[PDB]
Each structure stands twice: as C-alpha cells, then as structure tokens.
Amino acid sequence: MIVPVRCFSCGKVVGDKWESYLNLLQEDELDEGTALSRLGLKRYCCRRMILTHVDLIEKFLRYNPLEKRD
Amino acid sequence: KYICAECSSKLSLSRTDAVRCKDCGHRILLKARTKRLVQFEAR
Amino acid sequence: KPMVNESDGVTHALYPQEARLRNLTYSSGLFVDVKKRTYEAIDVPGRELKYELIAEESEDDSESGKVFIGRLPIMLRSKNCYLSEATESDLYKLKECP
C-alpha cells in the first residue's frame, strides 16, 4: 500500500520523500536514524510515518484481479 | 460484452451462447466496467 | 492427481481456483485391483466337499482391471496436490499467496 501522502499528526508531507529515502539506505549505506534526519524529518511523528511503513504495493503488482486460488 | 479470465480476451456473448472463451476455452468469464462513466451523488 | 469431469463428459485437471470460484470439491479418484475365482465341487452326502479351481478372472494385464471405487478429498499442499512443488513464480501465475 503506497506511502501516505501526509503525516497524520503534524500535517506535514512525507509522500514525496520515500523514493529519495530508499536511495540513502543502499546507495550510501547509511543507518536509519541519520537517513531519516537527512530529509528534515525532526518531529518523531514524521519519523514514525516513514520508519514503520510496510510497502505492500510491490506484491499486488505481480498479480492480477482475475484468478487467485486457495 | 465480457472478458476472459486467463488471457482477458475481448468477447461478446448472446443470451443463448455457451459461457466459454473462444481462444482458451475456459469456463470463467468476467464482465466489463460501464464504458460511459456515470456521475452520482452519495446520499 | 485431482481432476474434474464436466457435464459434457470432458475431463480436465482441477485446480484450487476453479474449485473455489465454481463451488467444486477438491478431490481425486481411487483405483483398486479386483480378482474373482469360481470353485465347483460335487456335493456327495456324507463326504467333505472338495472344490477345484476352474475359472479365475484377473485383468492385471489390462487397464480394465483397475476398478474405480470412489473419490477421496485432498488436503492442500500434501504430496498429491499440484501445489507441493510450486515455486514463487508458479504460485503467482496460478495466483497463490506465497
């Protein structure tokens, strides 16, 4: 499920930063805290938004709405 | 109109035709969404 | 392996998607060999009956010897089921949840 566009608490916008955040994690091999602070996420609620996100859109995408089995 | 379930082939079926796909021969057929978008008000 | 015969008499392997959507029953068929023997004896009063082999029907040399006996349900992912050896792409194209 694609990243929330806005922060549920302070109204800020975090939706656009997900793509750039993923870059710092393996291209620059940085840790999670410094990467989170590199993008201006300073309140811990924005860090909560980005840090604990389960990206489920890459699993539905390998799939079709037609013929799942059980 | 309808659509196949494996290859999603575009098919048209009458009220008497067999419910099958012509190319793959499967027995599972799906509808097609209303082509003309219809506006609504939620009440 | 599990399979289904439609009303038209055509036979095709049954997969869990079709069983789920079409309200079928995931099951397979059981085949058992059967052999028959007939013995005949002369019923002489006061004497023990001595039967002798005369006729023995055994079709082990032909595919007609397998008597169909019934259908047995199959539990998912067991040895017989098709899902046992499916890889991730196999599960996706058949549309399983990994």
Q: Which domain holds residue A44?
A: 1-66
Distance of CA B40 to the CA centre of its chain: 23
Dist CA B11 CA B31 (whole Å):
10
The total of other beta-carbon atoms located within 10 Å of residue A21's CB is 20
C-alpha distances in angstroms, A36 versus A13, A14, A19? 14, 11, 12
Half-sphere exposure for C80 (CA within 13 Å, toward CB): 15
Rounded Cα–Cα distance for residues A65 and A2 (Å): 18
Of A67, C6, A60, C25, nearest to B29 by C-alpha is A67
Determine contact: A62 vs chain C, CB below 8 A: yes
User: What's the CA angle centered on A50, arms A49 and A51, to 5 degrees?
Assistant: 100
Q: Does the annotation list A12 as a binding residue? A: no
> Which of A62, A66, A69, A70 to substitute to test the interface with C, most C CBs within 10 Å?
A69
Q: Which residue has the tokens 């013995």?
A: C39
Q: Count how many domains chain A has.
A: 1
The token duo for A7 is 């922060």
Quick check: helix, strand or coil at residue B13?
A: coil
Q: How many residues does chain C have?
A: 98
Query: Do residues C20 and A69 lie in contact, with contact meaning Cβ atoms separated by under 8 Å?
Result: yes
* CB < 8 Å to C76, chain A: 70
Closest Cα to residue C62, out of C29, C30, C28, C34?
C34
Q: What is the CATH number of the domain that holds A54?
A: 1.10.10.60
Element (H, E) at A38: helix A32-38
How far apart are the CA of C11 and the nearest CA of chain A, in angstroms?
20
Contact A21, A39 (CB under 8 A): yes
Domains of chain B: 1-43 (2.20.28.30)
What residue type is B18 in one-letter code? A
- For residue C5, the cross-strand partners are C11
Tokens of B13: 């079926």
Query: Angle, nearest 10°, between helix axes A44-51 and A17-26?
Result: 70
- Which of A19, A17, A25 lies closest to A47 in space, CA to CA? A17
Method used to obtain the model: cryo-EM
Assign 3-class secondary structure to chain C.
Answer: CCEEECCCCCEEECCHHHHHHHCCCCEEEEEEECEEEEEECCCCCCCCCCCEEEEEEECCCCHHHEEEEEEEECCCCCCCCHHHHCCHHHHHHCCCCC
